[PDB]
Amino acid sequence: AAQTNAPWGLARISSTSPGTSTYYYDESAGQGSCVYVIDTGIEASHPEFEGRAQMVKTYYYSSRDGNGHGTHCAGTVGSRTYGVAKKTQLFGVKVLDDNGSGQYSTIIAGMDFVASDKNNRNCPKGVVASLSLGGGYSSSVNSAAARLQSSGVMVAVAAGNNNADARNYSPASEPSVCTVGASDRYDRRSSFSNYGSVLDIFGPGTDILSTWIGGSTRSISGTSMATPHVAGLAAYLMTLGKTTAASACRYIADTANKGDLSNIPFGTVNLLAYNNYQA
Ligand SMILES: [Ca+2]
């Protein structure tokens, strides 16, 4: 398949080079996989989701996304126009309030929720979780992310937007998950992206067009936007049978574009997510 005039980030994850605008992908498009978006919720009624999105848990008085961030992330995972994995099922877990903040105890509960709830869903090709959130180091937050990964979910987490070493942020610093940095359309590390040895991979994170609340769309930037590209790529590759949840991060790193990015400090991987699709 070929989607012309795609968002630059989709085009980038199907290309060996910057500067193209078509997204190429296998038509299976993540069918039979599931992605949990652990964030501010998802506006499931958005037509871009085509009935494939639903809210499954909230820790607040409503399951509505009153912020937009979670809807934007879900759109990059799996919306029809803006998504990597255009046929995946999307499950929203609202651990962040409508101001975009959440207590660590609530975030931990949401991760343990996903580890159990996957047994209540039909995801024969595999289960992914996209965690576009983060704060200071907490061993409890890291151990919750580690447990989720151990349960058989591919966990993708944002490196954080502090232009600092991700070792000092959670769940970014948990070694066993897939920690995602952000790049821009000219293959530079995004100026805000955290870095360090704990990073596994970079994805597109600057000026990312996706869905928003009110049935709308907008471009925004962050490692939060890079993370759902990687989560959607994992869902896509699972459906193709190329990898499993336990192996997906290593598979993505093994098949990534190498050495493309500038401004990677020594000790941090120089790797940009790539779907290796050949039509
Ligand atoms: Ca890792």
Active site residue 207: no
Could you confirm whether 170 is annotated as catalytic? no
177 annotated as belonging to a binding site for a ligand: yes
Active site residue: 39, 65, 184, 187, which one? 39
How would DSSP label each residue in the chain?
-EETT--HHHHHHT-SSSS---EE--TTTTTTEEEEEEES---TT-GGGTT-EEEEEESSS--S-SSSHHHHHHHHHH-TTT-SSTT-EEEEEE-S-TTS---HHHHHHHHHHHHHHGGGS--TTEEEEEE---EE--HHHHHHHHHHHHTTEEEEEE--SSSSBGGGEETTT-TTSEEEEEE-TTSBB-TT--BSTT--EEEE-SSEEEEETTTEEEEE-SHHHHHHHHHHHHHHHHHTTS--TTTHHHHHHHTSEES--B-PPTTS--EE-------
Domains of the chain are: 2-272 (3.40.50.200)
Report the C-alpha gap between 15 and 22 in whole angstroms: 9
Ligand 1 centroid to residue 176 C-alpha, Å = 5
Distance 174 CA to ligand 1 centre (A): 7
Catalytic pick from 14, 33, 151, 224? 224
224 is catalytic: yes
Resolution (A): 1.2
Q: Is 175 annotated as a binding residue?
A: yes
62 contact partners, CB below 8 Å, separation of at least 6? none
